[PDB]
Amino acid sequence: RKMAFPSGKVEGCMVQVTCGTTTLNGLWLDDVVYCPRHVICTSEDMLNPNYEDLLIRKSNHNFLVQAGNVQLRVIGHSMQNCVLKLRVDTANPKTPKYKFVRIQPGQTFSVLACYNGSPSGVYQCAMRPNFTIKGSFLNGSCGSVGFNIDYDCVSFCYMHHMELPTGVHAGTDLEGNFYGPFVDRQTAQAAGTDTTITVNVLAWLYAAVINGDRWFLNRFTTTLNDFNLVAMKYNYEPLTQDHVDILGPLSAQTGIAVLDMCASLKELLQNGMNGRTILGSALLEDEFTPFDVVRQCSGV
Amino acid sequence: FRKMAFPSGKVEGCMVQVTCGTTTLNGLWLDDVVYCPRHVICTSEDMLNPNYEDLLIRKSNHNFLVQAGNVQLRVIGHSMQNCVLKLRVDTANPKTPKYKFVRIQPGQTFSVLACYNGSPSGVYQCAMRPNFTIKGSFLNGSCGSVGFNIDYDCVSFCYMHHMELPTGVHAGTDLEGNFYGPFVDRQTAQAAGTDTTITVNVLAWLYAAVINGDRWFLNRFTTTLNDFNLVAMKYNYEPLTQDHVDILGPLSAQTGIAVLDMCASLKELLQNGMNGRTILGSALLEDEFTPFDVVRQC
Ligand SMILES: *C(=O)[C@H](C[C@@H]1CCNC1=O)NC(=O)[C@H](CC1CCCCC1)NC(=O)c1cc2ccccc2[nH]1
Numbered sequence: 305r306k307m308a309f310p311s312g313k314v315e316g317c318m319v320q321v322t323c324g325t326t327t328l329n330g331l332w333l334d335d336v337v338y339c340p341r342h343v344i345c346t347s348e349d350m351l352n353p354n355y356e357d358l359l360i361r362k363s364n365h366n367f368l369v370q371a372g373n374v375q376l377r378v379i380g381h382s383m384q385n386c387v388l389k390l391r392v393d394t395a396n397p398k399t400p401k402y403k404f405v406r407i408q409p410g411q412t413f414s415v416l417a418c419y420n421g422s423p424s425g426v427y428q429c430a431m432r433p434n435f436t437i438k439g440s441f442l443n444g445s446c447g448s449v450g451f452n453i454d455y456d457c458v459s460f461c462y463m464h465h466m467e468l469p470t471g472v473h474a475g476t477d478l479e480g481n482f483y484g485p486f487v488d489r490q491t492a493q494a495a496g497t498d499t500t501i502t503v504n505v506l507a508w509l510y511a512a513v514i515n516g517d518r519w520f521l522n523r524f525t526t527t528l529n530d531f532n533l534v535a536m537k538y539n540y541e542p543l544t545q546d547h548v549d550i551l552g553p554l555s556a557q558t559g560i561a562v563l564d565m566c567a568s569l570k571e572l573l574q575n576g577m578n579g580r581t582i583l584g585s586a587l588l589e590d591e592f593t594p595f596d597v598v599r600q601c602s603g604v
Numbered sequence: 605f606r607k608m609a610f611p612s613g614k615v616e617g618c619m620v621q622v623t624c625g626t627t628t629l630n631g632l633w634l635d636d637v638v639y640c641p642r643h644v645i646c647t648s649e650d651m652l653n654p655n656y657e658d659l660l661i662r663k664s665n666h667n668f669l670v671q672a673g674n675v676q677l678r679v680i681g682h683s684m685q686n687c688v689l690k691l692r693v694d695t696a697n698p699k700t701p702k703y704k705f706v707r708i709q710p711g712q713t714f715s716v717l718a719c720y721n722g723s724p725s726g727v728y729q730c731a732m733r734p735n736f737t738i739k740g741s742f743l744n745g746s747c748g749s750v751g752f753n754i755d756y757d758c759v760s761f762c763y764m765h766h767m768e769l770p771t772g773v774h775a776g777t778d779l780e781g782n783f784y785g786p787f788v789d790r791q792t793a794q795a796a797g798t799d800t801t802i803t804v805n806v807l808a809w810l811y812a813a814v815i816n817g818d819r820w821f822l823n824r825f826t827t828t829l830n831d832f833n834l835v836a837m838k839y840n841y842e843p844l845t846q847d848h849v850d851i852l853g854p855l856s857a858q859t860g861i862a863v864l865d866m867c868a869s870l871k872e873l874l875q876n877g878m879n880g881r882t883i884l885g886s887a888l889l890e891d892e893f894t895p896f897d898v899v900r901q902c
């Protein structure tokens with residue numbers, strides 16, 4: 305099952321940011337509030353905004369930052385790629401130990417969906433190979449963030465900016481760089497064709513083996529190159545060296561070499577499951593990372 | 605459309621660790637009382653069959669080690685309410701939220717904050733199965749983890765975790781210490797009643813699938829409530845009541861699909877299967893979204 309990180313450390317950082325008639329969410333860490341720069345757009349600014357031009361016209365006193373209904377005075381503003389950084393006069397006492405990280409396709413994170421700076425829910429998301437996420441975002445959710453937690457340290461990896469016509473979502477890291485080829489303009493953008501996250505399917509197969517469900521283990525092995533060429537014919541992502549590395553602990557725990565599991569997956573792709581199931585499912589699951597499998601089987 | 609849990613922050617501030625002898629689990633710290641499963645007072649030999657009121661009278665306040673973070677809380681009182689131990693401590697929890705203890709109905713959902721050694725580990729949504737189990741994700745040391753709902757900053761606690769059945773499903777109590785279902789806190793292999801599928805929830809989730817733009821399972825047919833219930837019972841689905849039909853009112857208005865029209869679609873899905881197709885990414889009929897859950901998210 306999909307399990308989110310406890311969200312309390314991020315809840316204490318959510319604020320709302322209003323510029324004109326547009327209110328969205330911001331992330332208050334120390335004395336800086338981070339939010340999508342498109343908060344400074346008017347409804348006619350959105351087709352092709354000149355953000356440098358739009359920001360020159362704005363002053364500190366045009367930005368309404370509120371924790372609940374308590375206003376935080378803005379004392380400075382700047383733009384870093386597609387995120388606005390608003391310096392405020394109060395350091396957030398609830399600021400956790402944190403870092404800003406850019407995740408790879410296939411990595412998962414928890415999203416704290418927020419509206420008017422107020423947390424509404426938390427759920428686990430995977431960054432697809434086409435750099436969209438299947439979020440659950442409504443109007444006003446922009447500036448909601450995705451994160452992982454590692455031993456008290458919150459790693460922020462996603463800030464929400466927009467929905468594509470297909471209903472999936474696109475956003476930036478916390479340095480304002482979009483994931484994938486998207487831009488913050490209200491134009492016809494489409495997610496490129498998605499693929500299956502191979503490293504996560506392998507993680508899921510390791511999880512099946514750990515639980516005693518191992519009929520798919522075969523007597524074959526493969527090279528990484530050979531497997532990658534076949535996997536791409538089935539709309540599976542090629543494996544990287546980092547992928548092989550993050551499967552290391554699961555490979556060690558089960559004694560099944562990563563390339564042996566690749567050969568097992570290759571057989572499943574070429575032959576199907578034959579009505580058999582894996583972990584009580586006819587579909588290969590691709591939204592659990594090796595860390596998710598480990599985290600779910602340990603009390604971290 | 606995803607499975608969404610409530611933000612856990614208000615609950616995380618209440619989780620503590622409770623130790624008795626060689627047994628460690630989680631407790632819920634509300635004002636000056638810590639609530640935890642009473643089986644913390646069992647020794648390994650006691651767990652076999654425990655006379656709890658007898659085992660508890662033999663315990664002293666100092667037998668209970670309670671830790672909040674690095675701080676240790678002094679137990680100044682202890683009492684039992686059914687299967688829940690209540691440890692009075694000398695410090696009120698300053699992070700205590702507005703809260704209520706509620707006993708939920710089969711079919712209703714709640715968020716679980718899974719904790720280990722008093723520290724929160726993950727949050728996820730669960731439903732009370734019709735047979736009063738929950739399909740959780742709990743490991744050793746998760747006992748005392750709680751399930752809850754949040755309504756306008758009031759936390760309604762509804763579940764406290766006690767055990768894992770041999771089938772891997774889970775069993776626990778409300779916060780008054782009464783088990784959901786026929787289960788008992790003795791270390792014995794316990795089977796649940798035969799589970800059934802939560803019908804009103806499957807329908808809410810079908811409506812959710814419509815709101816998000818997939819309609820391949822809809823049909824032109826309709827059905828009566830009684831004829832649908834005959835087919836549902838044949839497939840081990842719970843009965844659909846008129847109250848359920850009314851509760852689905854808003855979703856039917858939103859999509860313009862009468863409830864009995866959607867029942868006919870589910871009848872078709874049950875009798876013909878999903879032909880290898882999928883709904884909202886799932887190959888099976890999902891029954892852990894309530895009408896409220898779907899409304900709140902859509
Ligand atoms: C921010 O709160 C919202 C989040 C959206 C709203 C509904 N569900 C979401 O995830 N963001 C937007 O509404 C953006 C605003 C634009 C302002 C200028 C720069 C680009 C973002 N717009 C969209 O998300 C959007 C535009 C668009 C055009 C044509 C079809 C679909 C579509 N979606």
Ligand SMILES: *C(=O)[C@H](C[C@@H]1CCNC1=O)NC(=O)[C@H](CC1CCCCC1)NC(=O)c1cc2ccccc2[nH]1
Nearest residue numbers: 643651742743744745746747767768789790791792793
């Ligand atoms: C508390 O932390 C654990 C949570 C379990 C452990 C593994 N996964 C879980 O959810 N609770 C237990 O281990 C209880 C211990 C007490 C139960 C009540 C009376 C005293 C012991 N036991 C079980 O969960 C358990 C015992 C048992 C015996 C035979 C078959 C299955 C079985 N499950």
